[PDB]
Write a protein that binds this ligand. Structure first.
Ligand SMILES: Nc1ncnc2c1ncn2[C@@H]1O[C@H](COP(=O)(O)OP(=O)(O)NP(=O)(O)O)[C@@H](O)[C@H]1O
Ligand SMILES: [Mg+2]
Length: 333
């Protein structure tokens, strides 16, 4: 549960294949471990542990089941792959299980935190790979809903893979305020629009693009209303017709009483950035999702012209019932 040796003994009781080396990721409901597969010629592999707290709530367990299903559903180079599903043979012992994925060197949150220099060529390849991945996910009728730098895995080859389908949605729910990271939520989410689209993932890419171009997270809200303030302070006060197009009645009312903020100068925010980069960034971060750039349009944008090259529908359907479904996904290996 905690020490590496304790985790190793736990994994060995599931499958003797995997040798643990070091913990590379920490989550709210489990840790991520760098392991080597002794039967696959000691190749490096990532292992994602799911702890007991997931199987205490039905909602949480249904989320993890969908995540495994989605990982197995996709077979693409820009989406993190699924290698195995380790589950306890005894239902009386099933209070945890492991998700085995391909290994990536690091992720973007990290990369940005190191303050490492990134060229426009680096950003172009990152952004296109992320968009191309989103196009595949969206074509399968799935919305990622959690597009953040931490959920974007990268190598020194600048190869990119999207991970964490833990909050993925069908292409209308009540968003929670009890969150640790709300800085990448689209304005339609922030303003409590019950029904949203795949454009919320585009917003996340824009936020990521804003940071890749040389910046800390653009919209650092401490709460929901404050998140809206941080967004509007930057992109500027939207037109009356756009305000009426997104948000609940109360959210629209608050936004109208707010003082006028002009569209901030992207050129001043990024003195070195190309006009193509600043336009894609501007269009990705449009208030109204209906006027916001789409994934297809973003892939065809002049900023990615040297990279652009001219999927099946995912079917959505107690805690014990979820556990049984997870082992069924394990049998497939
Ligand atoms: N295949 C992988 N290779 C390398 N690092 C990884 C890999 N998968 C995950 N990580 C790291 O582990 C972190 C957390 O993994 P993640 O899949 O995002 O679970 P999570 O953040 O807890 N969301 P949840 O689905 O609710 O568990 C990521 O931010 C990465 O830094
Ligand atoms: Mg994550």
């Amino acid at each position: 549960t905690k020490s590496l040796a304790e985790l190793q003994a736990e994994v060995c009781r599931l499958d003797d294949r995997y040798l643990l080396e070091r913990i590379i990721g920490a989550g709210s409901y489990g840790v991520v471990i760098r392991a080597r597969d002794t039967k696959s010629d000691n190749r490096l592999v990532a292992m994602k542990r799911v702890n007991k707290e997931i199987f205490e709530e039905v909602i949480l367990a249904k989320r993890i089941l969908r995540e495994i299903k989605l990982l197995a559903h996709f077979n693409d180079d820009n989406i993190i792959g699924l290698r195995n599903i380790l589950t306890p043979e005894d239902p009386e012992n099933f209070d945890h299980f492991y998700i085995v994925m391909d290994i990536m060197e690091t992720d973007l949150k990290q990369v940005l935190r190191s303050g490492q220099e990134l060229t426009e060529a680096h950003i172009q390849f990152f952004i296109y790979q992320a968009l191309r991945a989103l196009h595949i996910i969206h074509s399968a009728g799935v919305i990622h809903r959690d597009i953040t730098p931490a959920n974007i895995l990268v190598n020194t080859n600048c190869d990119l893979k999207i991970c964490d389908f833990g909050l993925a949605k069908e292409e209308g729910e009540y968003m929670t305020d009890y969150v640790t990271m709300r800085w990448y939520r689209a304005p339609e989410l922030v303003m409590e629009d019950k029904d949203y689209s795949a454009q919320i993932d585009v917003w996340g890419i824009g936020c990521i693009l804003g940071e890749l171009l040389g910046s800390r997270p653009l919209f650092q809200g401490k709460d929901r209303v404050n998140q809206l303030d941080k967004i509007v302070d930057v992109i500027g006060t939207p037109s009356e017709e756009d305000i009426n197009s997104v948000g609940s009645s109360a959210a629209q009312k608050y936004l109208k009483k707010k003082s006028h903020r002009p569209q901030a100068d992207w050129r001043q925010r990024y003195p070195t950035a190309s006009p193509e980069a600043l336009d894609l960034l501007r269009h990705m971060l449009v208030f109204n999702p209906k006027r916001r750039i789409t994934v297809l349009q973003a892939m065809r944008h002049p900023f990615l012209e040297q990279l652009h090259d001219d999927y099946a529908l995912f079917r959505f359907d107690t805690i014990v019932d979820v556990k049984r479904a997870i082992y069924e996904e394990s049998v497939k290996f």
